[PDB]
Amino acid sequence: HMNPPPPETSNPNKPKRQTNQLQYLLRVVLKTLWKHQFAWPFQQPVDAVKLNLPDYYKIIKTPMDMGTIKKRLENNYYWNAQECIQDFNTMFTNCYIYNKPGDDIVLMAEALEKLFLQKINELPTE
Numbered sequence: 001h002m003n004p005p006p007p008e009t010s011n012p013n014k015p016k017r018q019t020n021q022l023q024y025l026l027r028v029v030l031k032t033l034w035k036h037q038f039a040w041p042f043q044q045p046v047d048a049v050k051l052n053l054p055d056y057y058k059i060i061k062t063p064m065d066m067g068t069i070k071k072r073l074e075n076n077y078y079w080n081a082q083e084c085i086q087d088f089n090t091m092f093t094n095c096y097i098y099n100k101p102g103d104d105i106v107l108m109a110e111a112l113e114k115l116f117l118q119k120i121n122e123l124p125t126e
């Protein structure tokens with residue numbers, strides 16, 4: 001009946017780092033997916049109140065969205081690229097869990113996922 005609070009995007013207790021991999025994840029990976037026509041349902045946490053789905057946050061215990069990823073990268077929340085990649089993986093996995101193959105949202109996630117995995121193969125060295 002209420003939306004849970006969004007995931008943290010900032011932590012003063014969390015050590016900050018700016019690596020070539022992390023600048024690539026913001027400037028190339030995030031930027032590509034953020035401007036894609038299918039990005040919009042993934043750009044903010046699932047507003048399960050507006051959308052009238054109070055079962056969303058009962059099935060999905062680890063929510064993630066691109067808005068949260070974008071802020072985390074801008075806030076140097078991540079120490080390594082692998083924590084950011086795991087958040088992208090969580091965002092897509094959540095969509096596949098709640099929904100089922102052939103659903104338009106699932107097809108939109110797959111197109112974004114395809115484009116993400118292509119960009120991650122091209123990740124620079126440390």
Ligand SMILES: Cc1nnn(C)c1-c1cc2c(cc1F)c1ncc(C(C)(C)O)cc1n2[C@H](c1ccccc1)C1CCOCC1
Pocket residue numbers: 041042045046047051094095098099104105
């Ligand atoms: C991600 C994600 N992962 N799982 N889900 C359920 C979503 C998700 C799905 C969303 C929206 C937001 C979401 F975060 C959303 N926002 C607004 C509207 C309008 C404007 C219409 O009112 C429709 C929306 N939905 C739609 C849908 C609603 C309910 C069940 C499934 C899908 C989809 C939006 C694309 O086109 C396909 C349907």
